[PDB]
């Protein structure tokens, strides 16, 4: 009794959703799309390489101008690169050498970093004195930060190892809203184009769609078998892709509330570190532990190409807003731009 | 190349100059990862959300790290050594300690990292086996056939170090080895032991690259 009645109700609810999800699976996305011409072979070549990092690169984020990017490394350095001229714009020292995330504000006036210090640090770049000074040191998370994304110059969402996500007011320095419901460590975080929702991928082999204003979970997605390391919304905003350690990408639909396709091959055993889509969403780019990246056809689950230029783990991967270039950062302390 | 971007190129050169000069400064320091449990007493090893302690022995830099299941352990892929602290007095939690040591020894990211292992609070073990109120043969039945290769204390000490060494020698193919030690609260020659152990760790890698041993 007591907890037994609640446990039985939870089990019945889970079975109902499974039946409800099955009632909408009239036709597989693979079946529908087996009439379109394949994209063929994608021949992307290393155009510009970025040197200067001495330790492993753990994160990288593009700018909204599609020219400046910021990268974080274990050497306690944040570097802002002018990708067109390979020039170094800034070299921000870090109080902690342990960083796992890096964010670049949409306005370009701020950058964010975090890691094992359990702190999101926000650096103001467009100041007087011609230097870069820390403007906010967000504290309150009891676990390591995995990912942080800027909403605007005043709001930021952080993913931590305390199985929770938070929304911060930078000026006040407080947690406006906390997000609870994950069982394992939350590893990834992607913002929707309309900014009103975001998805989080955690070590519980599940993904959750959250409402920023409401603060409550709306949809939970469970189709994986291992930890989820990467996540990324479809450009439309009605779908997202997740990468796991089981060597498998899956595309989930928000409205259908279930998986659509799986991206897997028998010769891939290594886990997935980072995923992102292209400008039109036709190409899904995933980084792996086997020193290279794969380009998937998002509608037919076919390997369109391979990005093989790194001799260590590809940790971070990003696609510009205009879709011109793709940036890959690896554990070999190198950043490569592909076109 | 215009006037401003030529000046921007010169700024990048100075940034590169500072990047390489302080990278050399960090190249001369040795990074250590401190691991243990609540009762291990790992804070009071070297008298000197992540806590960093620094100590220098014979003019070499040591930079210790303290964090506090382990998804971040891949960040410590290139540390000089791992320092593991175990409370030998607590017989009940020893089985937990061996399970943690086995987990940390066979980690996919630490297959080539040596471990310096400290049996902290060796005095509490001395004034517990002699009393005889608690017997370590209860939790591990095989202390029954005890032999030393007070004896009751020496065999008790050697049995515990053998339990940890057996896990270390089970796998690894000799790439990384353990350095058992016995310590106490009043002991002060601890940074020296890490100094001697870290010297052997570096020497062995130099020997391997010379294809000598």
């Amino acid at each position: 009794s007591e907890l037994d009645q609640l446990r039985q109700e939870a089990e019945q609810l889970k079975n109902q959703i499974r039946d409800a999800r099955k009632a909408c699976a009239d036709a597989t996305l693979s079946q529908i799309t087996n009439n379109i011409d394949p994209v063929g072979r994608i021949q992307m070549r290393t155009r510009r390489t970025l040197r200067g990092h001495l330790a492993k690169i753990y994160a990288m984020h593009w700018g909204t101008d599609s020219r400046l990017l910021v990268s974080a490394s274990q050497d306690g350095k944040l570097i802002i690169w002018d990708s067109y001229t390979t020039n170094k714009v800034h070299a921000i020292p870090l109080r902690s050498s342990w960083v796992m995330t890096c964010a670049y504000a949409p306005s370009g006036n701020y950058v964010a970093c975090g890691g094992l210090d359990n702190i999101c640090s926000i650096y103001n770049l467009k100041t007087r004195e011609g230097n870069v000074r820390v403007s906010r040191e967000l504290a309150g998370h009891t676990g390591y930060l995995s990912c942080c994304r800027f909403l605007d110059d005043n709001q930021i969402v952080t993913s931590s190892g305390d199985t929770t996500c938070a929304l911060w007011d930078i000026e006040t320095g407080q947690q406006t809203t906390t997000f609870t419901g994950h069982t394992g460590d939350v590893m990834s975080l992607s913002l929707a184009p309309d900014t009103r929702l975001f998805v989080s991928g955690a070590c519980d082999a599940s993904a959750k769609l959250w409402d920023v204003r409401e603060g409550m979970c709306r949809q939970t997605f469970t189709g994986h078998e291992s930890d989820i390391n990467a996540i990324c919304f479809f450009p439309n905003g009605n779908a997202f892709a997740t990468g796991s350690d089981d060597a498998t990408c899956r595309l989930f639909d928000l409205r259908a509330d279930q998986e659509l396709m799986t991206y897997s091959h028998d010769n891939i055993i290594c886990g997935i570190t980072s995923v992102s889509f292209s400008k039109s969403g036709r190409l899904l780019l995933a980084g792996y532990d086997d020193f290279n990246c794969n380009v998937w056809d998002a509608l037919k689950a076919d390997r369109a190409g391979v990005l093989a230029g790194h001799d260590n783990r590809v940790s971070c991967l990003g696609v510009t807003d205009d879709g011109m270039a793709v940036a890959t950062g690896s554990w070999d302390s190198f950043l490569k731009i592909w076109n | 190349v215009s006037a401003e971007d030529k000046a921007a190129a010169e700024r990048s050169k100075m940034i590169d100059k500072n990047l390489r000069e302080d990278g050399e400064k960090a190249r001369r320091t040795l990074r250590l990862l401190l691991l243990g449990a609540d009762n291990s007493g790992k804070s009071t090893i070297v008298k000197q959300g992540i806590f960093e302690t620094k100590f220098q022995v014979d003019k070499v830099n040591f930079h210790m790290f303290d964090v506090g299941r382990r998804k971040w352990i891949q960040c410590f892929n290139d540390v000089t050594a791992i320092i593991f602290v175990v409370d030998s007095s607590d017989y009940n939690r020893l089985q937990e300690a061996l399970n943690d040591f086995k987990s940390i020894w066979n980690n996919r990211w630490l297959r080539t990292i040596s471990v310096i292992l400290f049996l902290n609070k060796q005095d509490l073990l001395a004034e517990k086996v002699l009393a005889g109120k608690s017997k370590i043969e209860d939790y591990f039945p095989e202390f029954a056939r005890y032999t030393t290769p007070d004896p009751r204390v020496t065999r008790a000490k050697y049995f515990i170090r053998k339990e940890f060494v057996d896990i270390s020698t089970a796998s690894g193919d000799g790439r990384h080895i353990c350095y058992p030690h016995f310590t106490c609260a009043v002991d002060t020659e601890n940074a020296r032991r890490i100094f001697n152990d870290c010297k052997d760790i570096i020497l062995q890698m130099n020997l391997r690259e010379y294809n000598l041993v």
Partner: single-chain antibody
Amino acid sequence: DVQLVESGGGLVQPGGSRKLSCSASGFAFSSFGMHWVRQAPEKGLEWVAYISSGSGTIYYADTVKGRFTISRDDPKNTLFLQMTSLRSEDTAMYYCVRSIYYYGSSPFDFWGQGTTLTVSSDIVMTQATSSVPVTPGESVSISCRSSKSLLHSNGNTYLYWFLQRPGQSPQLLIYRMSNLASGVPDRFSGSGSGTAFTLTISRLEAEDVGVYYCMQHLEYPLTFGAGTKLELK
């Protein structure tokens, strides 16, 4: 907070030597390239010398080359200008200008008070207007032309605008023909193409009067316009 305080100057006999010094206190002096700009007794604005951050690049105007020396003391947060064999043509107010150079930077942002010194293949930028009658609340357009196209092959056009109110050092308004300087009201705007540039001021008010100066940064020697004065009615 940011301040550039000048020192030196005075009455110097022709053929003498002098050493002007400007002290910087309030910003990262080491990371800033620095310029010297004079302004004749009652004439225009002329560039003199430049020293890069780290003292790795030094440029001089042809007038002062071989008899002017510019240096900086990073620990002392000061820069100097050692003048030798100075003549009557060197009598001017010597402004000291800070400048930084990266992508999206704002060079020539801060100017210091000048030093009054009294001695007893170039791009020509033409500001045809020299004085325009202006009524408050009206819209004012100032035109500028250059002998060479400032639009570079990288998409950046290197033209700058400055305002010098009476009794004050010039202040940056527009950098690269389109970007408002920090602290400049939104009523200022700039547009144009190579060889043809225009500064538009909407809803002109008080403290918006003075001399407006053009400048190129496409090629050293950096050169100014004559200057267009705005006066009341």
